[PDB]
């Protein structure tokens, strides 16, 4: 029957789902200590499913409100909610914070039976580290001859509405339709799952320090839903609007929200367009249609910075104000401006898309034998393919990158060499030499204080470095460009100072 079973140590919640879903919440810690789906225990026995590594101690209450059950867990700076609806095999959750947890990240981890749930979806065993020997920190491993990491399960938050772990008789999915209180914008990615040897972890990283570009946000994180299936795959269309009737701290209902609608125009039509709204309280995003038409998600009232991207490259920024119950009409327009192009390597999309090893880097370590050679490589304009240009240059692996190009007599005037990047590590930035002319050494970029390129990430501050080339420095015939990564810092192989390329363009 739908309801709550009370004992001194626990509340047992029965969702009354057709294929059965019951779970046990500790009244001492708020740990989920047992999960019964279709007559089968799914919870790892030695450690609970919980926020972080566990709340430790919490004040736990459980109440039925019509066809809903709410479990509330109160600590000093965090309130954890679990909500179920009669008939649905779902544990709906939301996490209210007034301060960032001590550890400096905010996550929910489900530690589940890896014999019953061995697989990870949608990316497969790239994040399966079971039987692995560590090759970097405590988070990148070699399993046989293949490099593996929990980070290789990651996906851009804009595209991460569902990820799962699964077996032949059970599937458990996170359904994530509310990233408003997260950090780092639409293109932030984070740890999704990890079959690590003792159990298979299913995550939602609400926020973290992994390649983090923004301050953390307080208030209500989520809702988020953990769906339990036999062999079905749940739709991401899951109503959580009933949260409005449960006195959930920090919850703002549809009625307390407004929208921004309009048309974006002017950017590169060969790329997907994204519009992004943010302030200290909340962040929102949407893809536009091919015509540039967009409507924001339902937004908390206030004033927002508004950004228009082609791919992940920002072409325009504006400001907009949102009021509850109202749609603000606001257009946005912009384009990437350079000049008369001599050569262009890559595209202005804020990504290393198309570069050597770019596709592999999302799902394996740079040291993996399946990677193509990092270099040092010589790229020759008009002969080399884009997949012959390294997605990243490391001070102590493939430094420097050499570019050969042909110029006509008409192209010997003044020019700008533009070196667009996505993400730096350990102070890495380019210094360029063109023939016998050496550009200035740019200062160190802002340190993001985390690994990235070795953990399937690339979305940084997107620093762009221009080098002014005087007239008569470019010559008719063959020219040589050398791109060195410089930094006062040092490291072994892929942990040496480095940056990931976005685009390299020479224009006049
Ligand atoms: Ca690019």
Swiss-Prot record:
Family: Belongs to the polysaccharide lyase 4 family.
Disulfide bonds: 30-73, 164-173
Catalytic function, reaction form: Endotype eliminative cleavage of L-alpha-rhamnopyranosyl-(1->4)-alpha-D-galactopyranosyluronic acid bonds of rhamnogalacturonan I domains in ramified hairy regions of pectin leaving L-rhamnopyranose at the reducing end and 4-deoxy-4,5-unsaturated D-galactopyranosyluronic acid at the non-reducing end
EC number in record: 4.2.2.23
Lineage: Eukaryota, Fungi, Dikarya, Ascomycota, Pezizomycotina
Function, in words: Pectinolytic enzyme that has a positive effect in the apple hot-mash liquefaction process. This endolyase hydrolyzes the alpha-L-rhamnopyranosyl-(1,4)-alpha-D-galacturonopyranosyl glycosidic linkage by beta-elimination, thereby generating oligosaccharides terminating at the non-reducing end with a hex-4-enopyranosyluronic acid residue.
Species of the source: Aspergillus aculeatus
Temperature and thermostability: Optimum temperature is 50 degrees Celsius.
The UniProt record lists the keyword Iron-sulfur: no
InterPro entries tied to this protein: Carb-bd-like_fold, Gal_mutarotase_sf_dom, Galactose-bd-like_sf, GH-type_carb-bd, RG-lyase_II, RG-lyase_III, Rhamnogalacturonase_B, RhgB_N
UniProt enzyme class: lyase
Alphabetized CDD domains for the sequence: RGL4_C (cd10317), RGL4_M (cd10316), RGL4_N (cd10320)
GO biological process: cell wall organization; pectin catabolic process
Example of a GO MF term: carbohydrate binding
Domain of life of the source: Eukaryota
pH behavior: Optimum pH is 6.0, enzymatic activity becomes unstable below this value.
Subcellular location: Secreted
Protein name as annotated: Rhamnogalacturonate lyase A
């Amino acid at each position: 029957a739908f309801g709550i079973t009370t004992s001194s140590s626990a509340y047992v919640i029965d969702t009354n789902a057709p294929n059965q879903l019951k779970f046990t919440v500790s009244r001492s810690s708020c740990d989920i200590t047992s999960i019964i789906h279709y007559g089968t225990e799914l919870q790892y026995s030695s450690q609970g499913s919980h926020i972080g590594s566990g709340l430790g101690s919490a004040t736990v209450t459980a109440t039925q409100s019509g066809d809903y059950i709410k479990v509330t867990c109160v600590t000093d700076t965090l309130t954890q909610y679990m909500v179920v609806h009669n008939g649905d095999p779902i544990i709906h959750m939301a996490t209210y914070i007034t301060a960032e947890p001590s550890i400096g990240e905010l996550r929910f981890i489900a530690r589940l039976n890896s014999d019953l749930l061995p697989n990870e979806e949608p990316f497969g065993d790239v994040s399966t580290t079971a039987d692995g020997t560590a090759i970097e920190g405590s988070d990148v491993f070699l399993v046989g001859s293949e490099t593996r990491s929990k980070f290789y399960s990651s996906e851009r938050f804009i595209d991460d509405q569902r990820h799962c772990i699964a077996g032949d008789a059970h599937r458990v999915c996170m359904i994530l339709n509310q990233y408003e209180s997260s950090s780092g914008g639409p293109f932030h990615r984070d740890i999704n799952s990890n079959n690590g040897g003792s159990y298979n972890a299913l995550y939602w990283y609400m926020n973290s320090g992994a390649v983090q570009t923004e301050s953390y946000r307080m208030g209500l994180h989520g809702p988020y839903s953990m769906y339990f299936s036999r062999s079905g795959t749940p739709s991401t269309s899951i109503d959580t609007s009933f949260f409005a009737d449960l006195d959930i701290k920090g919850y703002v209902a549809a009625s307390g929200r407004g929208k921004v609608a309009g048309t974006a125009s002017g950017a590169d039509s060969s790329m997907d367009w994204v519009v992004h709204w943010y302030n200290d309280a909340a962040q929102y995003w949407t893809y536009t249609s091919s015509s540039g038409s967009f409507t924001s998600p339902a937004m908390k009232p206030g004033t927002y910075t508004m950004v228009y991207y082609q791919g992940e490259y920002a072409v325009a920024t504006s400001s907009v104000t949102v009021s509850a119950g109202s749609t603000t009409t606001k257009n946005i327009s912009g384009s990437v401006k350079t000049g008369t192009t001599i050569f262009k390597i890559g595209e202005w999309d804020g990504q290393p898309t198309g570069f050597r090893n770019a596709a592999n880097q999302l799902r394996m370590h740079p040291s993996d034998s399946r990677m193509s050679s990092w270099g040092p490589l010589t790229y020759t304009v008009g002969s080399s393919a884009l997949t012959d240009f390294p997605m990243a240059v490391f001070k102590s692996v493939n430094n420097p990158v050499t570019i050969k190009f042909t110029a006509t007599s008409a192209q010997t005037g003044a020019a700008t060499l533009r070196i667009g990047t996505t993400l730096s590590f350990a102070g890495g930035r380019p210094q360029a030499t063109i023939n016998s002319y050496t550009g200035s050494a740019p200062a160190a970029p802002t340190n993001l204080d985390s690994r990235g390129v070795t953990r399937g990430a690339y979305r940084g501050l997107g620093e762009v470095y221009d080098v002014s080339i005087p007239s008569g420095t470019i010559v008719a015939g063959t020219n040589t460009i050398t791109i060195n990564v410089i930094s006062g810092s040092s490291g072994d192989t892929y942990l040496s100072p480095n940056f990931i390329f976005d685009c390299v363009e020479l224009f006049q």
